[PDB]
Design an enzyme around this catalytic site. Structure first.
Site, PDB file in Angstrom:
ATOM      1  N   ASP A 140      -7.518  -0.656  -1.342  1.00  0.00           N
ATOM      2  CA  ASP A 140      -6.567   0.242  -1.967  1.00  0.00           C
ATOM      3  C   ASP A 140      -5.149  -0.314  -1.962  1.00  0.00           C
ATOM      4  O   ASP A 140      -4.207   0.422  -2.270  1.00  0.00           O
ATOM      5  CB  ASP A 140      -6.617   1.596  -1.262  1.00  0.00           C
ATOM      6  CG  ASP A 140      -6.422   2.746  -2.210  1.00  0.00           C
ATOM      7  OD1 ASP A 140      -6.135   2.483  -3.395  1.00  0.00           O
ATOM      8  OD2 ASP A 140      -6.567   3.909  -1.779  1.00  0.00           O
ATOM      9  N   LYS A 179      -5.687   8.052  11.207  1.00  0.00           N
ATOM     10  CA  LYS A 179      -5.603   7.328   9.944  1.00  0.00           C
ATOM     11  C   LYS A 179      -6.987   7.066   9.373  1.00  0.00           C
ATOM     12  O   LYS A 179      -7.246   7.310   8.185  1.00  0.00           O
ATOM     13  CB  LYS A 179      -4.856   6.013  10.169  1.00  0.00           C
ATOM     14  CG  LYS A 179      -4.989   4.983   9.065  1.00  0.00           C
ATOM     15  CD  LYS A 179      -4.266   3.711   9.478  1.00  0.00           C
ATOM     16  CE  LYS A 179      -3.987   2.790   8.310  1.00  0.00           C
ATOM     17  NZ  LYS A 179      -3.219   1.585   8.724  1.00  0.00           N
ATOM     18  N   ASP A 187       0.830  -1.193   0.000  1.00  0.00           N
ATOM     19  CA  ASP A 187       0.000   0.000   0.000  1.00  0.00           C
ATOM     20  C   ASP A 187       0.873   1.254   0.000  1.00  0.00           C
ATOM     21  O   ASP A 187       2.067   1.214   0.309  1.00  0.00           O
ATOM     22  CB  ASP A 187      -0.968  -0.011   1.187  1.00  0.00           C
ATOM     23  CG  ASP A 187      -0.269   0.094   2.537  1.00  0.00           C
ATOM     24  OD1 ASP A 187       0.978   0.113   2.593  1.00  0.00           O
ATOM     25  OD2 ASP A 187      -0.984   0.155   3.559  1.00  0.00           O
TER      26      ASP A 187
END
Length: 926
Positions: A847, A715, A646
């Site tokens: 993602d 986050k 990521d």
């Protein structure tokens, strides 16, 4: 509304070969002037096509006479059908010549009729035979190669250059054929019994009594449902002859026994909480349609043709077999000759809803349980019925063949309607909301533009998957006997039973796929995101699911693969996450003893893995590090486990690239660095200073949140703010028992506002791009137009938010996140296609980009390259010009369209950041 239903009624009657039935309605409707006005040429042609296949020349002539009586000029469909019937009956040449004389004078050219008015191959052959009998030669148009996209981004992927190494699956062609036969039987039945992983109940009189009562109840339900189906069919048939639209052919498409069985399977599958009536009706209608399509294919020989075609296609996807010229799967399926089915297109939404509702009503009324009806209407299973199921504890749980991953390689996405499951119709758009608009844009768009999306989806689907035996056994041991919530295996224990059932279904499917290789296709989204078609066993579901799922294909680690695996383990644990990669590898070396002890004794050991944030993934990486070190050569070792790369906040990276920002580039690792910079930590510090200011202010939200703004919470809020359209953020705060949960919602909202303000203040590019996108979206929605935009790949993406007109605020705030998702999908798809050219196996989870350990470096470099190319291409300028040409060109709303013109023209100015350094950014996707 009624016209669509009538058209659907006549097409459905062709499939049931109920031509007299359809014709009786048409004649009655023709007699009534008002109904005749509704009647259209397409309906007349549909009746014509059915009679022409039946070969009833007299009936076809009568339909043509009705067309003249209405006064409609016969179209290409009418003439193609008359010619095909003439071929069916081998009528004399003179009549065919007279039909060709009627054509062109009032039927257009025969070439146009052949080229357009797409019909079944039998229809085309019969029309061609009639034309051959008649004096004209028909002059059949020659075939032309399919168009290839010339876009600069897709130029490398679609170039004809021979320096390509497309991957081939390890499994042999014959084994793939056997797997195909197994999948074909699965599609045939649309139902696969899967053993439950729950511990079997001790046999007892109460359990046996519950099973016997349940079996008798199922038999009674079957008989009552069959009687109800007969009664409803007879009533609908009587209505059809009377002259009122009915769903009789829709019920006849599938056998009565099959419909009864599907209804009973829905009753069984329905959860204790229940499901929405509209969702249930949609499910029943889609299931009726899928099972009908399967039946039609098998009876009509489309399955046989599919067997031949797919067997030829498998050579590309089988290592043993070879194809002389390498091609992408869609290109192969097109060169072999895609057998496009007409039925592939679904019924209109009203008709589908009516059918599903009728079937659900039949189930609810027919089923009776001694205490009365089993289903209560938001359908609710009877409490005694749920108790009986719990006591019975049936070993096998029947799941849909679609829900289960395919045991055969997924069919190429030659078109949005034709892809993924071979027998069951699968639309390209995952999102139910605004489905018609989503696919209308896809269809209007030229095929070359959507070729890249189709190819990327096919590539993601092609990748093989296998369960991990060790992880599955350990998880089964924890799951069956109590559970470990912290580890992530649900305990027997509202939310708790749903979680336990979800675990039960996933583990049961894993047990069924204990050693078989299963292929799951990937279905796109409006945001271009890619989501696996199997709902039960998708890797996205949970950390435990990701740990279970490892690539079936075996890849040698290579010289640096072992280092990548160790770095991956450190990343998975989360310890030393913002330190250099060399430090992370060194930490892995330091904690190797704990790593191995966790790999060997998960349950009765040091249990160091449990402390790590992702315990099951940590355990799987531990197993593959133990196996690597134990093996004589780590490089030779084949690591099935995926390695994830990521890239911090990808949306923030996109914003900073879109509007050049030096500080943004440095913060989000878009600028070369050695000490990695945590974006979340920086935003948390800004949130802390704003927290001090709020503490000075009268509001106590800050005093409540003091010392309670962790990096993880920041986050979640940052991801929501950037690539999100809040629940996760509040849940994070709840986990902290010390944090006063009296203000969990208030704190989540305040945190979202503060993080958004912090992000804008720190990032000039992000603030400018967000401001322009939001203002443009609002001024576009002002004209009652949902903001649509074409991705750099060329895929049409349209926002589906609607209020029963577009919502100005929902579109305005949504547009920056949706645009970021579109760019993220475009970047991932370019990376995937280039990796496919390299031969790398690429799968995208959420993602995060997933690939084998050896392939991590090449994937990272491809990512960087694609990102650079994408942003170097003028995304902002092209979007501004596109939106001007689309929305601004509105004579009706020109007055505010001129202000939108000004707003779009004032694109956010780029700063001074060089995109090339992204390639040299070490931590961009580390």
């Amino acid at each position: 509304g009624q016209q669509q239903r009538l058209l659907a009624f006549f097409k459905c009657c062709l499939l049931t070969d109920q031509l007299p039935l359809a014709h009786h309605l048409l004649v009655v409707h023709h007699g009534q002037a008002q109904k005749r006005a509704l009647l259209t040429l397409d309906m007349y042609n549909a009746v014509m096509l059915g009679w022409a296949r039946q070969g009833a020349f007299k009936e076809l002539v009568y339909v043509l006479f009705m067309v003249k009586d209405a006064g409609l000029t016969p179209d290409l469909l009418s003439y193609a059908a008359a010619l095909q019937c003439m071929g069916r009956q081998d009528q004399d040449a003179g009549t065919i010549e007279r039909c060709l004389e009627q054509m062109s004078q009032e039927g257009l050219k025969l070439q146009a009729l052949f080229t357009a008015v797409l019909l079944s191959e039998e229809d085309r052959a019969t029309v061609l035979k009639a034309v051959h009998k008649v004096k004209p030669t028909f002059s059949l148009p020659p075939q032309l190669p399919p168009p290839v996209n010339t876009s600069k981004l897709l130029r490398d992927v679609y170039a004809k250059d021979g320096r390509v190494s497309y991957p081939k699956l390890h499994l042999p062609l014959k084994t793939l054929q056997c797997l195909f036969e197994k999948q074909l039987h699965m599609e045939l039945a649309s139902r696969v019994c899967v053993v439950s992983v729950e511990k079997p109940t001790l046999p007892s009189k109460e359990v046996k009594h519950a099973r016997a009562t349940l079996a008798t109840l199922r038999d009674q339900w079957e008989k009552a449902l069959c009687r109800a189906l007969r009664e409803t069919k007879n009533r609908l048939e009587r209505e059809v002859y009377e002259g009122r639209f009915s769903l009789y052919p829709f019920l006849c498409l599938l056998d009565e026994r099959e419909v009864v069985r599907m209804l009973l399977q829905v009753l069984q599958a329905l959860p204790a909480q229940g499901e929405s009536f509209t969702t249930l009706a949609r499910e029943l209608s889609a299931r009726t349609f899928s099972r009908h399509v399967v039946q039609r294919q098998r009876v009509s020989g489309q399955v046989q043709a599919l067997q031949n075609h797919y067997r030829k296609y498998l050579c590309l996807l089988a290592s043993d077999a070879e194809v002389p010229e390498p091609c992408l799967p869609r290109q192969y399926w097109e060169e072999l000759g895609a057998p496009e089915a007409l039925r592939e297109q679904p019924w209109p939404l009203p008709v589908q809803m009516e059918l599903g509702k009728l079937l659900a009503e039949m189930l609810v009324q027919a089923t009776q349980m001694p205490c009365v009806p089993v289903l209560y209407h938001i359908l609710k299973p009877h409490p005694a019925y749920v108790q009986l199921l719990e006591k019975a504890a049936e070993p096998t749980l029947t799941f849909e063949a679609v829900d289960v991953p395919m045991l055969c390689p997924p069919l190429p996405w030659t078109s949005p309607h034709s892809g993924a499951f071979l027998l069951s119709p699968t639309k390209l758009m995952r999102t139910v909301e605004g489905a018609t608009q989503h696919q209308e844009l896809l269809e209007t768009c030229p095929p070359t533009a959507l070729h890249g999306a189709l190819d990327a989806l096919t590539q993601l689907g092609n990748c093989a998957w296998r369960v991990n035996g060790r992880v599955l056994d350990l998880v089964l041991q924890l799951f069956q006997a109590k559970g470990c919530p912290q580890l992530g295996v649900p305990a027997p224990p509202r939310e708790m039973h749903s979680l336990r059932a979800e675990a039960l279904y996933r583990l049961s499917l894993a047990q069924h796929l204990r050693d078989r290789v299963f292929w799951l296709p990937h279905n796109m989204d409006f945001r271009g995101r890619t989501y696996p078609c199997p709902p039960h066993f998708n890797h996205l579901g949970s950390d435990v699911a990701r740990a279970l799922l490892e690539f079936a294909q075996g890849r040698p680690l290579g010289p640096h693969g072992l280092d990548w695996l160790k770095i991956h383990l450190v990343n998975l644990t989360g310890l030393k996450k913002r330190e250099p990669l060399r430090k992370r590898l060194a930490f892995a070396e330091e904690v190797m003893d704990d790593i191995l002890d966790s790999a060997d004794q998960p349950l009765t050991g040091r249990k160091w893995w449990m402390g790590a944030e992702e315990p099951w993934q940590t355990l799987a990486c531990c197993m593959e590090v133990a196996n690597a070190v134990r093996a004589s050569d780590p490089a030779a070792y084949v690591s099935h486990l995926p390695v994830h790369q990521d890239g911090s906040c990808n949306g923030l990276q996109h914003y900073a690239a879109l509007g050049r920002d030096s500080v943004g580039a440095a913060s989000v690792n878009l600028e070369p660095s050695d000490v990695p910079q945590d974006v979340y930590s920086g935003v948390a510090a800004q949130v802390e200073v704003f927290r001090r200011q709020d503490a000075q202010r009268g509001m106590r939200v800050a005093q409540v949140l003091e010392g309670f703004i962790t990096r993880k919470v920041v986050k979640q809020t940052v991801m929501t703010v950037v690539y999100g359209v809040r629940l996760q953020i509040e849940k994070r705060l709840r986990e902290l028992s010390d944090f006063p949960q009296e203000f969990v919602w208030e704190a989540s909202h305040y945190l979202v506002a503060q993080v958004f303000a912090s992000l804008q203040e720190m990032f000039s590019g992000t603030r400018a791009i967000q401001h322009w996108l939001t203002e443009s979206a609002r001024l576009i929605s002002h004209m009652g137009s949902v903001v649509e935009w074409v991705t750099p790949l060329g895929v049409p993406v349209i926002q589906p938010y609607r209020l029963d007109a577009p919502n100005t605020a929902k579109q305005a705030n949504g547009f920056p996140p949706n645009f970021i998702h579109s760019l993220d999908s475009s970047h991932m798809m370019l990376t995937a296609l280039h990796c496919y050219r390299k031969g790398l196996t690429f799968v995208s989870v959420h993602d995060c980009y997933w690939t084998h350990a050896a392939d991590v470096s090449v994937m990272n470099q491809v990512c960087r390259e694609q990102f650079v190319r994408l942003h170097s291409e003028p995304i902002l300028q092209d979007l501004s010009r596109f939106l001007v040409k689309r929305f601004c060109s509105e004579p009706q709303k020109i007055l505010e369209a001129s202000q939108l013109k000004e707003t779009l023209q004032a694109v956010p100015k780029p700063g001074a950041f060089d995109l090339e350094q992204v390639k040299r950014s070490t931590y961009f996707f580390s």
